[PDB]
């Protein structure tokens, strides 16, 4: 009965994730308050990355329920690489949006025309390429069961290049943005977008922080309770579903588009 309960819970999580991300993509690609602005393309892509991250959740679910790998060595390698890639891609996408905001806030002094779609698409391609090349090389460098042939170096490299380094980069970027704004009534579209993005960053950090923290701890040499560690591992996949709720709660026109 436990197996059925876990399978149903994970299936509902997958369905909610896919539904929310499809709705977000449609809303970004429809209406006028969302389609006309160009910054919403980054949001649409983050939605797409979360959406495609539902070919990873079912395989981890199958591993948990069965207790052994049932897909082959090559698929095990592909699953590991792509599972790392998706979380790394999401966090580096948040970092890229923050960096684009920082660049824009410091470029208006030198004037800028309306070439934004080219810049947005360039960032789109660049962040995916960086996410691939910051995750695959460490993986390729290092009764069936899907394993990691680790010498305790892949854990540190993965956590540093996936969680800690982008977190430090975004902390520095937003400190610089705050200082610039401090040096330099109603709310604007840009203010709403920045607030929604900041709430998304907070949600992502508070969700993925426990798992990467205890992963670093296991690298250092501290044992971890197994059930708590599995819950922390799945709580990031829960974050995947939580993100569209953050979009639909704190921004009204997204809610109107979802209703339509």
């Amino acid at each position: 009965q436990v197996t059925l309960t876990l399978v149903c819970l994970a299936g509902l999580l997958m369905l909610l994730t896919v539904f929310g991300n499809v709705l977000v993509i449609i809303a970004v690609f429809t209406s006028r308050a969302l389609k006309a602005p160009q910054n919403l393309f980054l949001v649409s892509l983050a939605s797409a990355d979360i959406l495609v991250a539902t070919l990873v959740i079912p395989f981890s679910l199958a591993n948990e329920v069965m207790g052994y790998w049932y897909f082959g060595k090559a698929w095990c390698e592909i699953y590991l690489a792509l599972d790392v890639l998706f979380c790394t891609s999401s966090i580096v996408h948040l970092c890229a949006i923050s960096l684009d905001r920082y660049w824009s806030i410091t470029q208006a002094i030198e004037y800028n025309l309306k070439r934004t779609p080219r810049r947005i698409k360039a960032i789109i391609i660049t962040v995916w390429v960086i996410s691939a090349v910051i995750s695959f090389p460490p993986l390729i460098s290092i009764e069936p069961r899907c394993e990691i042939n680790d010498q305790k170096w892949y854990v540190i490299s993965s956590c540093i290049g996936s969680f800690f380094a982008p977190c430090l980069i975004m902390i520095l970027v937003y400190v610089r943005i705050y200082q610039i704004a401090k040096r330099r009534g109603r709310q604007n579209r840009e203010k709403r977008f920045t607030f929604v993005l900041a709430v998304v960053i907070g949600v992502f950090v508070v969700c993925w922080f426990p798992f990467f923290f205890t992963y670093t701890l296991t690298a250092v040499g501290c044992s971890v309770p197994r059930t708590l560690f599995k819950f922390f591992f799945w709580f990031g996949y829960c974050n995947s579903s939580l993100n569209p709720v953050i979009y639909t709660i704190f921004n009204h026109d997204f809610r109107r588009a979802f209703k339509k």
Binding site: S60, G67, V84, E147, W153, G221, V224, R226, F229
Partner: protein
């Protein structure tokens, strides 16, 4: 005997163990796809693999690594 006890970053510790637990066991318990905990220690002959987990059993000195 004098086999590896703690193996991770920041040094690898090789230690002995009291008599009656001379042999060295290295038990692998797999939590998620990307975490396979290893426990290296001493035992009389070798302990049991509960929950169907791989456990290598060694009689010589320094076999667990």
């Amino acid at each position: 005997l004098t086999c590896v006890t703690k193996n991770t970053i920041f040094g690898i510790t090789t230690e002995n163990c009291p008599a009656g637990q001379n042999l060295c066991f290295k038990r692998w318990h797999y939590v998620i796809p990307r975490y396979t905990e290893i426990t290296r220690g001493c035992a009389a002959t070798c302990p049991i693999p509960e929950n169907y987990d791989s456990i290598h059993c060694c009689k010589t000195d320094k076999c667990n690594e």
